[PDB]
UniProtKB/Swiss-Prot annotation:
Subcellular localization, as worded in the UniProt entry: Nucleus; Chromosome
Start and end residues of each Bromo domain: 9-113
Coiled-coil features, chain-numbered ranges: none
Expression (tissue specificity): Highly expressed in testis.
Disulphides: none
Assembly notes: Component of some HBO1 complex composed of KAT7/HBO1, MEAF6, ING4 and BRD1/BRPF2. Component of the MOZ/MORF complex composed at least of ING5, KAT6A, KAT6B, MEAF6 and one of BRPF1, BRD1/BRPF2 and BRPF3. Interacts (via PHD-type zinc finger domain) with unmodified histone H3. Interacts (via PWWP domain) with dimethylated and trimethylated 'Lys-79' on histone H3.
Function: Scaffold subunit of various histone acetyltransferase (HAT) complexes, such as the MOZ/MORF and HBO1 complexes, that acts as a regulator of hematopoiesis. Plays a key role in HBO1 complex by directing KAT7/HBO1 specificity towards histone H3 'Lys-14' acetylation (H3K14ac), thereby promoting erythroid differentiation.
Cross-link (Glycyl lysine isopeptide (Lys-Gly) (interchain with G-Cter in SUMO2)): 41
Protein name, entry field: Bromodomain-containing protein 1
Length: 121
C-alpha cells in the first residue's frame, strides 16, 4: 500500500534524524569509553551486575536496521549506556565521570531532537 510506503518514508526520516543525534552524542565521548560493548573476556562478571548492557556500536546496529520506532526508544538505549556505567563504576573513576559528562552534554542535544521530532511530526 501507499500508506505503508508513507510510513516507511517517516521511519526513514526518523532514522535519518536519529543518526545525526547519535553522531552528536558520540562526539561528547572523545575518549571512546562508550563506543563498544563492555568485554566479557575482560570483565567476566559483568552480566552479574548489569542486566541490559548497551553501547554506541550496538545502538548504531539497531539504528541501521531501523529498529528505533520513536525517540523514546532511542533515549532508553542512551540512558542505559550512562546508567549502567554509573552503577558498575564508583564515583571516583574516570568511567563514572565520563558518564556524568555525556549525560550533561547529551541533554542539550536530546532537548532539541525532541522539539524536531514533534515539530517535523
Amino acid at each position: 500500500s501507499m500508506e505503508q510506503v508513507a510510513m516507511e518514508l517517516r521511519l526513514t526520516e526518523l532514522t535519518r534524524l536519529l543518526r545525526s543525534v547519535l553522531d552528536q552524542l558520540q562526539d561528547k565521548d572523545p575518549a571512546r569509553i562508550f563506543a563498544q560493548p563492555v568485554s566479557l573476556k575482560e570483565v567476566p562478571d559483568y552480566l552479574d551486575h548489569i542486566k541490559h548492557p548497551m553501547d554506541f556500536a550496538t545502538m548504531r546496529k539497531r539504528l541501521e536496521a531501523q529498529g528505533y520506532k520513536n525517540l523514546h526508544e532511542f533515549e532508553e538505549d542512551f540512558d542505559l549506556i550512562i546508567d549502567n556505567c554509573m552503577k558498575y563504576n564508583a564515583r571516583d573513576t574516570v568511567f563514572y565521570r565520563a558518564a556524568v559528562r555525556l549525560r550533561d552534554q547529551g541533554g542539550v542535544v536530546l532537548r532539541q531532537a525532541r522539539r524536531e521530532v514533534d515539530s517535523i511530526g
